[PDB]
Amino acid sequence: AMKIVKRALTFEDVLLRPGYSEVLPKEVKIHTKLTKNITLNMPLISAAMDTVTEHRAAIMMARLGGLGVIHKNMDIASQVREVKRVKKSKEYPDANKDNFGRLRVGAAIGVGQMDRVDALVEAGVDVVVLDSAHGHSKGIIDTVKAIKAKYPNLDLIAGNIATAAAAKALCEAGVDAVKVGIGPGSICTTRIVSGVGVPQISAIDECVEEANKFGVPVIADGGIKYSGDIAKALAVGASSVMIGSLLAGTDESPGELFTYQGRQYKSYRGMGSLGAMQKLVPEGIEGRVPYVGSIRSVVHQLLGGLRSSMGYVGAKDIEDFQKRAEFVEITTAGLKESHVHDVTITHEAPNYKV
Amino acid sequence: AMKIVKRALTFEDVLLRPGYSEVLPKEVKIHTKLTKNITLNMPLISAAMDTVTEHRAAIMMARLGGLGVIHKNMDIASQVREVKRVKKSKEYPDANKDNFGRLRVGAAIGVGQMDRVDALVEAGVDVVVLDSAHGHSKGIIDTVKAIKAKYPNLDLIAGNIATAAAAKALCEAGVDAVKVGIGPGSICTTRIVSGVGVPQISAIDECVEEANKFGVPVIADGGIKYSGDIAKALAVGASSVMIGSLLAGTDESPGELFTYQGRQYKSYRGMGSLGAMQKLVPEGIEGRVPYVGSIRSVVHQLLGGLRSSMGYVGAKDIEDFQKRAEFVEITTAGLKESHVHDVTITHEAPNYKV
Amino acid sequence: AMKIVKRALTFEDVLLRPGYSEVLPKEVKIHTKLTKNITLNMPLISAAMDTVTEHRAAIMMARLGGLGVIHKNMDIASQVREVKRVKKSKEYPDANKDNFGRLRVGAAIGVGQMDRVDALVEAGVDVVVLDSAHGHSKGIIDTVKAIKAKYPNLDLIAGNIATAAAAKALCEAGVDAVKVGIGPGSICTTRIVSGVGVPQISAIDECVEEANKFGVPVIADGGIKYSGDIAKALAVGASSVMIGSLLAGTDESPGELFTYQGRQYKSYRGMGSLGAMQKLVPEGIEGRVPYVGSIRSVVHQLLGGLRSSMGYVGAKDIEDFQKRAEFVEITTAGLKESHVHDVTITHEAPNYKV
Amino acid sequence: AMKIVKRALTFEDVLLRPGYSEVLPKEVKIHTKLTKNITLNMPLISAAMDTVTEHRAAIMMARLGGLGVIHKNMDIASQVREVKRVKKSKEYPDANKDNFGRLRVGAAIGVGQMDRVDALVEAGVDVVVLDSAHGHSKGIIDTVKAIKAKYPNLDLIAGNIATAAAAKALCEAGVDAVKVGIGPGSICTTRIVSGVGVPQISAIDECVEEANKFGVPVIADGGIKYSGDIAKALAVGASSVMIGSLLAGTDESPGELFTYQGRQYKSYRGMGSLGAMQKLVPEGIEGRVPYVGSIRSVVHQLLGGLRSSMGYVGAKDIEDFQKRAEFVEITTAGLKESHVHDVTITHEAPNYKV
Ligand SMILES: C=C(C)c1cccc(C(C)(C)NC(=O)Nc2ccc(Br)cc2)c1
Ligand SMILES: C=C(C)c1cccc(C(C)(C)NC(=O)Nc2ccc(Br)cc2)c1
Ligand SMILES: C=C(C)c1cccc(C(C)(C)NC(=O)Nc2ccc(Br)cc2)c1
Ligand SMILES: C=C(C)c1cccc(C(C)(C)NC(=O)Nc2ccc(Br)cc2)c1
Ligand SMILES: O=c1[nH]cnc2c1ncn2[C@@H]1O[C@H](COP(=O)(O)O)[C@@H](O)[C@H]1O
Ligand SMILES: O=c1[nH]cnc2c1ncn2[C@@H]1O[C@H](COP(=O)(O)O)[C@@H](O)[C@H]1O
Ligand SMILES: O=c1[nH]cnc2c1ncn2[C@@H]1O[C@H](COP(=O)(O)O)[C@@H](O)[C@H]1O
Ligand SMILES: O=c1[nH]cnc2c1ncn2[C@@H]1O[C@H](COP(=O)(O)O)[C@@H](O)[C@H]1O
Ligand SMILES: [K+]
Ligand SMILES: [K+]
Ligand SMILES: [K+]
Ligand SMILES: [K+]
């Protein structure tokens, strides 16, 4: 007999039940925690990818109350430059600011890049995001120990993990948040290339339960296709959500729009695709996503879905949302009924593309 | 661990078992209850949408023994006008009439629109349909209390809900029927935009069980794709069914037919689509449905399927249908076997479009 | 709570396990029982449809050791004529013959058509097939009683049923076989139009268990897409299988081949389609199936699959096949792995069309 | 009631959980056992098919540390010739060699072909692969007995089986490895034609458990679509994997590339297809697969996925991989999330084609 630990679910497998509500969606509060010490005025973080976040995206993210993580596929001096650009930036009331009244920013690092870390810290970065394919490893854990030993009060996010044991090891090493998601990313092939991963909803749930013991927030990273998924991710216990594909088609993301066969697009590619890495064995693809206009407008629709959700559940804030949330498991047939069905769409909605 | 209340099913997940029958389908009775006090000679209600029901559709609906609900996306004086048109309308033996021998009609209202309610009541409307995205809310419940306090004998339908607790709160507030369906509508994106909803078959079953305690009928609204679904909905305990997409392509629905690429259509759109509401965060889309001719002919095929169903089950009437009904859960493979399979359709059937 | 009797499976949901075998497929015996008194040299029956079986198909069926049922969508005098043509027909060693050494034939009848029955009996028909949408009804059961009372030794098949209770009622009325299948037919829309049916594998299993108590064979009718399905149907306990779509494209079936867009076809339609019945509420469609050549060649491939199957299981004959058979339930993913996958077919196989 | 032994899973139904890792993928060891006495420096075997393995493919396979099995669809003298070509062949450090320092090779045989066996043995073949549609049969078992009685120290692989009982019978007869897979092959139609088979992951698991009692390795043959599947197969307990479709499009496989509609391909067909066998009842199809270049490069990507996998699990070698492995069952929705989703691929990856 093979050891099957459980049957794991992801977003399309569950729904939230409506509950008694005394709140309208414009009234709910959506402030949350990025780390033990850093709060967000809204729970969205743009992914640390070279087709998603550099200074322009990071600036808008923080202006809107979230955060951008500057990717690390560039040399130390450039990444420092990108950070300083964000730091040096009534129209944006919910802006997410540091002590100097400057916009907050995150910056990605890898294993054993203490040089990069020194430079980013001196440049005034708010949080360092230590990302790896496998956060549950000696390499990553040694790096956390080295960083916290050298910078005891630097906010450090570490990822990516998918199990409770992984969350424990990272929290015990002293991280300020853990990032969850092995393989759910739109451009990610890890689960297919290696056969390894945990469906995202189950992964978040397992990791939150363990991380809560340390009061360490969980970041749910990857696999968000719609606003409803953000709601579900937050409802199950994640404190924030990290998004790549939904933000890659924006004005502010790196790169320019192009038109192919009468549609507008931008490139979007995984950091583990051959393209991004330049024989290599990739765990990501290079692709394109539809052009969707301003980051502002995209975030507005996403947050509106979250607001709507909390309204349906009766939650006044994210914490209240998490305690009230009840899920129902659905079937393939229920997924179809949930989507648009038996009607051809003639005017596309801003928040639902089929 | 995440709190999963249950695994919920919708229509495509179940079938009715055939049982011993002494009745032919032309002999079964299909009279039912719309509310505590209002009966239907057949269990179909046309949806309160600006692409489905105005006076023409409402008139035909009631003539055929059902009801139409005039939508509320128009000013008070127009909606009053639409109601009066229905009231002022041997060829139609099963017609559904009031005390004056006039056709019955429903008219939709929202939260805190008592002005609209006064006007509709004075115009002689038979039932007011208080619709909201979230019927299980203080807003809706306060409105019910205010309406029943002012008009103790006005038949009031309230919706939409999807849980037993929601049904209890509404029944205790004094409603005459509850309307069930969060997210199953063909043009509805609520479940995707907010992540909230309950698969329709499970939702009806849960709400009926609670509503029965008060002798309050349940209206199953949305997600009907075929005549079989109506049968299933009634069999599980709903007293009537509300239909949008299947009636939107009729002569009688508002709007005109147009031809696109050699097919005939009519527009059909959700009331929560951007189009219908005129930044906004929609929960519906704008679309088109095939043109299907007269309301008469469509209803004939639908009711024929219901009749056939009750025959197979051996039910002499809807009440008997509900007590005899036994379901079987099926699989994806069983759904395929159920549909047409392994043959290409060359002459389309009136009651089955693939 | 809704009364769900069980979770029902159909063919694509199961596989047979291989077992220890001392037999090759050319050595297994495939004789079986059509009814209590009539045996087949092979277990296939062609459906009683006006696009499948008239004299030519029936003749070939019996020559090959099976049976054809002449459809009843024609007047009494014509159907009598078709029967007499079969009766009046070393090249066909396994031929299925009566007392006169004439080919056996079946002929369909409906409720209260005793006139048709007298005429068919006098014409020398071997078995009368009383078919109805709902075999579990007073109409059908009264007809069985009337026929067995008048013709105590006439072999009577009655259908169609899908439950154990239905099988009991028919067996107690004195039928010689029961026919199983509500809604699995390729051209059938009953499950969608009325919401009523039982997935075919579960239906056979339930009915066999009850019918065995009376020593009454079960005929599994409808839903056969491939040779493997025949094997599964027989393995679960059915004594024979009735086939429409797989035989409709043959030389011998009524009608001529035509070519459309470079492919050859024949018409195939349900008896409850509008076309076949000539307002009406159909439970079938009119369609087309690929032209597949001779009945001989089609049956050869089908029987070869059965032979192969019994080989894999180690069965020396159908009875032995039924006692040895063990199933495994599979998943959607297992179904994909089972089919051809990840390769494009360039030369089509005679026994597998994708 | 029908006897359902279990619900069986295949590859797409499971994932491996990540665990704590102190190893990088370039450090894990991938040596394994082909049989009791023959080791591989890497766990891949090319299928014994006339579109996959003759001398050129076999030579490269062994050079890379695996093995090729020369197919038997040719006369004895030719197959002997192919074997001698392999035997007569620092650039290939991991090469898989015999006592003479010559490349190892396998050669396929059928039931009662002792003549072929004598010739292959005298030609110096390293392992004889006795393949049959049904390894669990008197024919196959008698052949094993005859071969081991005549050649007690000749390494004999026998297949194909799918049950624990089949594994027991073969191990007790004295085989050196068993080969597992009834019906999962890309070009295989056995499960559809006969209704018989076991989903590959369940089949391996069941057979390994029994074979381990004898210290007999299990070869998982067929159904491998991606590198992740190899990992999963090894993780569940198989000692090696046999591959057809993934190697059929290589330079080294028999046949030439051709271009059709702007894509490059090679033919790939089952040994039980009509084409390969030349009325016959096939259990395979003739098809085409994309041209993928050198065997070297394909194997590199496959092994890279395995290495990556073991890294994620923390396994230092295959044996350690097997003891650490924990699976999670996923849903259809989880499979979608696992694949690339919601992005159009613009530059294809070498190790992931959609
Ligand atoms: C986010 C992922 C998966 C990512 C990002 C960048 C590069 C990569 C590559 C190099 C393709 N894969 C990669 O680094 N995989 C890996 C697997 C297991 C262990 Br232990 C360590 C590393 C992967
Ligand atoms: C039927 C629905 C969902 C509908 C109909 C019209 C408009 C809308 C819009 C405005 C898009 N959505 C809407 O009113 N949503 C909503 C969600 C939760 C709570 Br609490 C209150 C309202 C929704
Ligand atoms: C095999 C079927 C379903 C069939 C064949 C011919 C005609 C029909 C039609 C007339 C369309 N349907 C039909 O006879 N349906 C039916 C349903 C319940 C009861 Br009780 C009695 C009859 C159905
Ligand atoms: C690998 C398979 C299935 C294969 C390979 C070559 C030929 C065949 C053919 C001849 C089509 N099938 C075949 O030999 N089937 C078979 C089934 C049961 C028993 Br017991 C014995 C044999 C099958
Ligand atoms: O190439 C890669 N392989 C695997 N995961 C990746 C790769 N590149 C980015 N990711 C992850 O995928 C996330 C984005 O997923 P998305 O929001 O679903 O598009 C990022 O935040 C990373 O965690
Ligand atoms: O835009 C909207 N969002 C969500 N539900 C809607 C919207 N508009 C109409 N509905 C519901 O959908 C039902 C029609 O669903 P249908 O019969 O499946 O097409 C209506 O009766 C309403 O209850
Ligand atoms: O129109 C109809 N409605 C429902 N079932 C039908 C109809 N016509 C034929 N059938 C059934 O379908 C069977 C053929 O199914 P097939 O072998 O899957 O194509 C016949 O033997 C009948 O039992
Ligand atoms: O025609 C056949 N019928 C059934 N299985 C076959 C046939 N030919 C080859 N196989 C099996 O399929 C395997 C290849 O499967 P693949 O790796 O999925 O393409 C071979 O190693 C054989 O075990
Ligand atoms: K919907
Ligand atoms: K069907
Ligand atoms: K297959
Ligand atoms: K993915």
**Minimum CA–CA partner of B323 in chain C:** C3
Structure tokens, A241: 């959500």
**Minimum CA–CA partner of C170 in chain B:** B20
Structure tokens, D204: 């391996």
8 Å CB contact between D284 and D271: yes
Distance CA C45, CA C280 (A): 29
Q: One-letter amino acid identity for B155?
A: D
Helix (H) or strand (E) holding A221: strand A218-221
- Read off φ and ψ for residue C93, nearest 5 degrees: -60, -40
Distance CA B192, CA A339 (A): 7
**Minimum CA–CA partner of A274 in chain D:** D349
Nearest to A140 by CA among A174, A110, A167: A110
DSSP A136-150: SBHHHHHHHHHHHHH
Task: Find out whether the beta carbon of B242 lies less than 6 Å from any atom of ligand 6.
Answer: yes
Cβ separation of B225 and A342 shorter than 8 Å? yes
User: Is the sign of the CA dihedral D306, D308, D311, D313 positive or negative?
Assistant: negative
Distance CA B250, CA B291 (A): 6
Secondary structure (H, E, C), A89-137: CCCCCCCCECCCCCECCEEEECCCCHHHHHHHHHCCCCEEEEECCCCCE
Apex A97 CA angle, A93 and A98, nearest 5: 155
* 3-class secondary-structure state, position D154: coil
Chain breaks in chain D following residues, C–N > 2.5 Å: 89, 278
Nearest to A241 by CA among A59, A46, A14, A8: A46
- For an interface test with A, the pick among D210, D312, D324, D351 (most A C-beta atoms closer than 10 Å) comes out as D312
Cβ separation of B199 and A333 shorter than 8 Å? yes
Distance CA B292, CA B250 (A): 6
8 Å CB contact between C159 and C132: yes
Task: Give the other-Cβ count within 10 Å of B273's Cβ.
Answer: 23
Q: What value does the CA radius of gyration of chain A take, rounded to a whole number of Å? A: 19
Nearest to A247 by CA among A29, A115, A71, A116: A71
SS3 content of chain A, % helix, strand, coil (to 5): 35, 20, 45
All residues of chain A having their beta carbon less than 8 Å from the beta carbon of residue B245 are 342-343
Distance CA C231, CA D193 (A): 9
DSSP B251-294: TTSSS--EEETTEEEEEEE-TTSHHHH-----SB-EEEEE--B-
With b meaning 16 or more CB within 10 Å and e meaning fewer, what string describes C46-82? bbbbbbbbbbbbbbbbbbbbbbbbbbbeeebeebbeb
All residues of chain D having their beta carbon less than 8 Å from the beta carbon of residue C304 are 281
For residue A191, which ligand has an atom nearest its CA?
12
Distance CA D110, CA D72 (A): 8
Distance CA C173, CA C141 (A): 7
Apex A243 CA angle, A237 and A245, nearest 5: 140
All residues of chain B having their beta carbon less than 8 Å from the beta carbon of residue A229 are 195
- For A306, half-sphere exposure in the C-beta direction (CA atoms, 13 angstrom radius) is 27
Phi and psi based region of residue A174 (left: phi greater than 0; alpha: psi -120 to 50; beta: remaining)? left
All residues of chain C having their beta carbon less than 8 Å from the beta carbon of residue B331 are 7-10, 13, 199
Nearest to B289 by CA among C11, A218, D260, A345: A345
Nearest residue (CA) to ligand 1, atom 20: D311
Cβ separation of A305 and B161 shorter than 8 Å? no
Pocket, ligand 4, Cβ cutoff 6 A: C 21, 24-25, 308, 311-312; D 133-134, 137, 190, 271-272, 282-283
Structure tokens, C233: 């149907």
Structure tokens, D41: 């420096």
List the strands of the sheet with D263-269, edge to edge.
C344-347, D286-290, D263-269, D258-260
Neighbours of chain C (3+ CB pairs under 8 A): B, D
Structure tokens, C261: 């867009």
Cβ separation of D309 and A194 shorter than 8 Å? yes
Choose the catalytic residue: D45, D171, D188, D230: D188
- Read off φ and ψ for residue D140, nearest 5 degrees: -60, -45
Nearest to A337 among B223, B281, B335 (CB): B223
List the strands of the sheet with C263-269, edge to edge.
B344-347, C286-290, C263-269, C258-260
Nearest to B203 by CA among B187, B189, B218: B218
Counted across chains A and B, CB pairs separated by less than 8 A come out at 214
Structure tokens, B245: 């997409």
Distance CA A341, CA A343 (A): 6
**Minimum CA–CA partner of B193 in chain A:** A228
Active site residue ranges of B: 188
Distances (CA, A) of C114 to A62, B43, C66, D269: 85, 39, 26, 57
Does A188 participate in catalysis according to the annotation?
yes
Which residues are within 8 A (CB) of C99 and not within 5 positions of it... i.e. 6 or more apart? none
With b meaning 16 or more CB within 10 Å and e meaning fewer, what string describes A282-321? bbbbbbbbbbbeebeebbbbbbbbbbbbbbbbbbeebebb
Distance CA C251, CA C291 (A): 8
Structure tokens, A262: 């009468």
Cα dihedral A37→A39→A43→A46 (10° resolution): -70
Q: Given 3.60.130.10, 3.40.50.2300, 3.20.20.70, 3.40.50.1820, which CATH number is that of C1-354?
A: 3.20.20.70
Q: Is D197 annotated as a binding residue?
A: no
Cβ separation of A228 and B283 shorter than 8 Å? no
User: Is the sign of the CA dihedral C221, C226, C227, C230 positive or negative?
Assistant: negative
Task: Find out whether the beta carbon of A300 lies less than 6 Å from any atom of ligand 1.
Answer: no
Nearest to B18 among C162, C193, C223 (CB): C162
- Ligand 4 geometric centre to CA of C234 (Å): 21
Cβ separation of D195 and C236 shorter than 8 Å? no
Which residues are within 8 A (CB) of B93 and not within 5 positions of it... i.e. 6 or more apart? none
* 3-class secondary-structure state, position D344: strand
Which of A141, A283, A285 should be mutated for ligand 1, with most atoms under 8 A from CB?
A283
Task: Find out whether the beta carbon of A25 lies less than 6 Å from any atom of ligand 2.
Answer: yes
* 3-class secondary-structure state, position A328: strand
For residue D233, which ligand has an atom nearest its CA?
8
Which of D129, D283, D285, D286 should be mutated for ligand 4, with most atoms under 8 A from CB?
D283
For residue A106, which ligand has an atom nearest its CA?
5
Q: How was this structure determined?
A: X-ray
Q: Are strands D258-260 and D240-243 parallel, antiparallel or unpaired?
A: unpaired
Task: Find out whether the beta carbon of D283 lies less than 6 Å from any atom of ligand 8.
Answer: yes
Cβ separation of C1 and B205 shorter than 8 Å? yes
Choose the catalytic residue: A125, A129, A188, A247: A188
Q: Name the DSSP letter for residue B17.
A: P
Cα dihedral D219→D222→D226→D232 (10° resolution): -40
Length of chain D: 354
Distance CA C273, CA A314 (A): 51
Nearest to A154 by CA among A297, A38, A289, A281: A38
8 Å CB contact between D136 and D156: no
State the residue for tokens 């929560």: B272
Q: Are strands B263-269 and B258-260 parallel, antiparallel or unpaired?
A: antiparallel
Task: Find out whether the beta carbon of B243 lies less than 6 Å from any atom of ligand 6.
Answer: yes
C89 CB burial (10 A radius; 0-12, 13-18, 19+) = middle
Cβ separation of A134 and D18 shorter than 8 Å? yes
Q: Are strands C177-180 and C218-221 parallel, antiparallel or unpaired?
A: parallel
Q: Which atom of ligand 2 is nearest to the CA of B182?
A: 3
8 Å CB contact between B96 and B62: yes
Task: Give the other-Cβ count within 10 Å of A137's Cβ.
Answer: 25
**Chain centroid to CA A202: how far?**
16
All residues of chain A having their beta carbon less than 8 Å from the beta carbon of residue D226 are 192-193
Structure tokens, A111: 């294993």
- Read off φ and ψ for residue A328, nearest 5 degrees: -125, 140
> Maximum distance among all alpha carbons in chain C?
63
8 Å CB contact between C158 and C165: no
Which residues are within 8 A (CB) of C262 and not within 5 positions of it... i.e. 6 or more apart? none
Q: Name the DSSP letter for residue A25.
A: T
8 Å CB contact between C253 and C267: no
Nearest to C67 by CA among C139, C154, C128, C146: C128
Q: Which atom of ligand 7 is nearest to the CA of B341?
A: 18
Distance CA D204, CA D179 (A): 9
Q: One-letter amino acid identity for C34?
A: L
C344 CB burial (10 A radius; 0-12, 13-18, 19+) = middle
